Write a structure and sequence with these properties.
Chain lengths: 99, 60, 127, 207, 155, 125, 79
RNA sequence: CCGCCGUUAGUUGCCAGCGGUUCGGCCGGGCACUCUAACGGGACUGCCCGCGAAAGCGGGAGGAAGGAGGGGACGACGUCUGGUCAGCAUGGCCCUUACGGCCUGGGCGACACACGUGCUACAAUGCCCACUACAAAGCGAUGCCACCCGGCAACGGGGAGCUAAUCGCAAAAAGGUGGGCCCAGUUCGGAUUGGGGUCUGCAACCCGACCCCAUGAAGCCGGAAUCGCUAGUAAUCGCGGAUCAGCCAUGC
């Protein structure tokens, strides 16, 4: 019922948040639908070298939008408690949806 | 024409087809990604200078 | 009881499920000579069990999606080659010189920047 | 002379950003708008004494106002009053969540932008190009470095014609991933035009 | 190139019978990635070959193949700015490669209707010993002879 | 098949017969074989005579063909030069009707290229 | 152009209102070659700003809903 | 990045496995199969045979894979008095009731020739109508729009779903079954133009694109010559998006 999506920009710190969840989620609670990874937005981008007119000669760039998901089944007081209080999502903004 | 380009796009005239993009960190309109509000060139300068997050050297 | 093959060539996924019988060669929900006709790559999909012509003794229930038609067919081929590599790995060391194990790296090289196709550049002006 | 930005050649893992927070489509641009305007404001009315990192992490209106300064002493002022109203202007324009971070990177000969700034300062204080630059390089090698390369580009010390200038020492390997090299760009300047100082500090293999 | 000696590399040993040349000829029928339609039509042409005259389509094939096989061919000798157009005891590989190519394009130089028509018919004449591809071939052999002068300027 | 202005196509499929004909392309010919009840597949050489009669009773007693068309062309083109409603003014030029590019391409509404002695250019070296 | 309507400046309309019920001067100097030569301008002198001068066109009648600027290209010389 | 298998993971996937099923992976349920994304193993002339004084050459196997396995990024010292204050600076000069700030149309779309880049064709391996299938990626809140209604169509009115592996763009085409053209400037080829609407947007004549009927011209395959291309590459065939009110979109 308490299903929480995960918006994040960098993949390394991403698991560290999900693992932080995964542990304390089950630890204090119960069955937590394991770290289900969601296909990254790899936003397409191109741009040439100079300020100039050498048309060719380009450097493509992209957006690296990483998103994941955590899902629980039990209404533990403590789960809710620390795991919506004890947080540090510096470059991670999370979605919280009561399905 | 350079100081007023910035003011036309800012003050906003009348009709809806009287509006145009502007790289605010280089004051230009042509090839300016609306998603960043920056020119391909401004995007580029701050990208190489290493200050653009959620973006990277695309490798695919 | 069941023979699974991971049928893959150039992003064409083929789940190979083999059973005993005469050859229920169904793929994706249609008979073989129906999903793939008017094309010879069809028969070569059968080739794995034609170089070891047990062929018939296998209600060949395969599923195949993704990538491309012919490519699908070939993926299916390698899958078959891996489903019997399971039950009876004796076929593995004979089919290895035959080459029914080598996958496929004949892939889609990226649309390189500045060209009309993979390796196809614009024409020279100058003159 | 296509020396791709070392930072650009560090993006993979070998260097971190000066901003790291989330943005959901339509809002990204607005972030980078303010974000950068702050950044630059900080840059200007604060640069006074060494500072590279224009770092800021964020999310729901919260702002991790972060920065790696050099000297912190008189730059904090006479009790914390320099920081006070500056942070008040940040809080002003960015009426959201200022949380100042004033740091320090011990060594001047660390972090290429810093010595870069020193080098531009040499010539901005009308001083011998090759000399001051070579000696700053030797400072880099002295304090404890693995590479020292800083070049100055422009109307070199005088006379119309204008190129760059040699000041290399040690090893400067920069085709390598793990080399963790800092890159700075001092904006040198003269009454008669523009000079360009580029600094390269090689720090270490596989860290 | 100036490095190695390239090679030729494998083709495909007839996805129905069991021989390269069949499917290689198919390769040199190809209508732009159309091994599909081109092979299709080649085999249409094959079955109709067997139905018209019933003598082993690979006997008629081998026959056309050889009867269009240039043992010697006229190239261009190296004397700087003067190419003495000199023959050569050609390698049999190119002999047969050329061979099948000439067969194809000659059958194509026909103004008939559909493909298997031009194929079957020109392949009949080519087998027999009159075909247009065979006209070109006999021409080249004859050029090896008309270049009796160029007997010792080969590359 | 002298239906319209002496149009006689002949022994082909009726619709193609009508193809080689002013005022009628594939569309008006299909709808001919619709509003006449005749079959498109059968030949125009074996076409029954009262069928052709009611066909001409369709075509000529409905729209118009080659006569009125190019004539009304020349007329509404008198209007193209009545004052010179710029498009038609460009038609009075003996030049294309649009406003595209006459700097090169015009190889239709202006006859074959009228050779000039180059002129020369600007030192590109 | 338009779909449900015929694009016409209200300058035309408004100034037609004025000089029609009074019977005033000739000369119509609209600084716009956009509006339509609608039948609501009979056959009068139309000195519209060509881009240099005010090209005065004597409208016929068979002009109808066919645009103003249609009647002065400013493109000196042609072929 | 791409390929083998390996670990966890299970609103996409899933009978693979069982019940049900408006009998649709639709409801139950599962995670091994698809997949997804971090974490790994894996190829090192390391082993086998012959060869050279060595490098290394050829052949055997194992193997997803040989002997640089395909790629992208990375492109040194240095040259070119290369280019750019119409990206930005910043230097020097000149303009300052105007080389400056604004509005209005015309223009950067002109036309008697010229190369250069490109697409469409000049046709029967052809191509028009029809019937069915397989891509991968991307993109979508006053945005995406399925579907119903409406015009013969263009497209318009209505109106469900999604800040998304769950809704939508979307229909791939090439193909394959099945129908025609019967070598014809053709039913090829759509160029050119007349009669009519659509939507955009203050506004579409000169200056948008889109659709119907008719026109259906050039063109029956390109001399001197020059371009590209070493394997999913050439060729051929299709898709999205960057800027975008709209679109000049054969470009990228």
């Amino acid at each position: 019922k308490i299903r929480i999506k995960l918006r994040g920009f960098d993949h390394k710190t991403l698991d560290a948040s999900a693992q932080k969840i995964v542990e304390a989620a089950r630890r204090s609670g119960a069955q937590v639908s394991g770290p289900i990874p969601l296909p990254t937005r790899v936003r397409r981008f191109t741009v040439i070298r100079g300020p100039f007119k050498h048309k060719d000669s380009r450097e493509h760039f992209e957006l690296r939008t990483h998103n994941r998901l955590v899902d629980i089944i039990n209404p533990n007081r403590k789960t809710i408690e620390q795991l919506m209080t004890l947080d540090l999502p510096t470059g991670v903004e999370i979605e919280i949806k009561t399905v | 024409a350079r100081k007023a380009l910035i003011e036309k796009a800012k003050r906003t005239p009348k009709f809806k087809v009287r509006a145009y993009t502007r790289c605010v960190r280089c004051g230009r309109a042509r090839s300016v990604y609306r998603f960043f509000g920056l020119c391909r060139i401004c995007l580029r300068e701050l990208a190489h200078k290493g200050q653009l997050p959620g973006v990277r050297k695309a490798s695919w | 009881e069941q023979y699974y093959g991971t049928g893959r060539r150039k992003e064409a996924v083929a789940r190979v499920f083999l059973r005993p019988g005469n050859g229920k060669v169904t793929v994706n929900g249609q008979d073989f000579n129906e999903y793939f006709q008017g094309l010879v790559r069809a028969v070569a999909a059968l080739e794995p069990l034609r170089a070891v012509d047990a062929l018939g003794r296998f209600d060949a229930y395969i599923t195949v999606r993704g990538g491309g038609k012919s490519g699908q067919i070939d993926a299916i081929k390698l899958g078959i080659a891996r489903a019997l590599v399971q039950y009876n790995p004796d076929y593995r060391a004979k089919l290895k010189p035959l080459g029914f194990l080598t996958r496929d790296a004949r892939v889609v090289e990226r649309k390189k920047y500045g060209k009309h196709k993979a390796r196809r550049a614009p024409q020279y002006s100058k003159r | 002379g296509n020396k791709i930005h070392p930072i650009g050649f560090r993006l993979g893992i070998t260097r971190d950003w000066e901003s790291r927070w989330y943005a959901g489509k339509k809002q990204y641009r607005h972030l980078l708008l303010e974000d950068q305007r702050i950044r630059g404001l900080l840059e200007k009315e604060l640069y006074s004494a060494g500072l590279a990192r224009v770092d800021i992490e964020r999310a729901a209106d919260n702002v991790a106002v972060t920065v790696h300064v050099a000297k912190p002493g008189v730059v904090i002022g006479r009790g914390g009053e320099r920081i006070r109203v500056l942070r008040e202007e940040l809080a002003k324009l960015t009426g959201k969540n200022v949380a100042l971070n004033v740091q320090e990177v011990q060594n001047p000969n660390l972090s290429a932008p810093l010595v870069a700034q020193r080098v531009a300062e040499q010539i901005e204080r009308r001083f011998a190009v090759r000399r001051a630059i070579k000696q700053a390089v030797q400072r880099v090698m002295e304090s404890g470095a693995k590479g020292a390369k800083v070049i100055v580009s422009g109307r070199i010390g005088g006379a119309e014609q204008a190129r760059t200038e040699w000041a290399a020492q040690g090893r400067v390997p920069l085709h390598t991933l793990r080399a963790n090299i800092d890159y700075g760009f001092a904006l040198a300047r003269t009454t008669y035009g523009v000079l360009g100082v580029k600094a390269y500090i090689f720090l270490g293999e596989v860290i | 190139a100036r490095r190695r000696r390239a090679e030729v590399r494998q083709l495909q040993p007839d996805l129905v019978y069991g021989d390269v040349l069949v499917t290689a000829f198919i390769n040199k029928i190809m209508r732009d990635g159309k091994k599909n339609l081109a092979a299709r039509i080649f085999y249409d042409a094959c079955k109709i070959i067997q139905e018209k005259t019933g003598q082993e389509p690979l006997k008629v094939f081998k026959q056309a193949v050889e009867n269009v096989k240039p043992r010697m061919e006229v190239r261009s000798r190296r004397v700087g700015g003067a190419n003495y157009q000199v023959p050569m005891e050609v390698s049999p590989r190119r002999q047969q490669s050329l061979a099948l190519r000439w067969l194809v394009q000659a059958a194509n130089q026909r103004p008939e209707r559909r493909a298997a028509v031009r194929i079957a018919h020109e392949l009949m004449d080519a087998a027999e010993g009159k075909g247009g591809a065979v006209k070109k071939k006999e021409d080249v052999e004859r050029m090896a002879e008309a270049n009796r002068a160029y007997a010792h300027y080969r590359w | 098949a002298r239906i319209a202005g002496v149009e006689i196509p002949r022994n082909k499929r009726v619709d193609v017969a009508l193809t080689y004909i002013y005022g009628i392309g594939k569309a008006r010919a299909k709808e001919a074989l619709e509003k006449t009840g005749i079959n498109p597949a059968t030949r125009v050489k074996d076409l029954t005579e009262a069928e052709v009669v009611r066909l001409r009773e369709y075509v000529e007693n409905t729209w118009k063909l080659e006569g009125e068309l190019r004539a009304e062309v020349a007329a509404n083109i008198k209007r193209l030069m009545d004052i010179g409603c710029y498009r038609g003014l460009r038609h009075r030029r003996g030049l294309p009707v649009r406003g595209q590019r006459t700097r090169t391409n015009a190889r239709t509404r202006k006859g074959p290229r009228k050779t000039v002695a180059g002129k020369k250019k600007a030192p590109r070296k | 152009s338009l779909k449900k309507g015929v694009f016409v400046d209200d300058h035309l309309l408004e100034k037609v209102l004025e000089l029609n019920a009074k019977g005033e001067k000739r000369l119509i100097k609209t600084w716009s070659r956009r509006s339509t030569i609608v039948p609501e301008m009979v056959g009068h002198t139309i000195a519209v700003y060509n881009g240099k001068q005010h090209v005065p066109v004597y409208i016929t009648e068979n002009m109808v809903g066919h645009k103003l600027g249609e009647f002065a290209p400013t493109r000196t010389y042609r072929g």
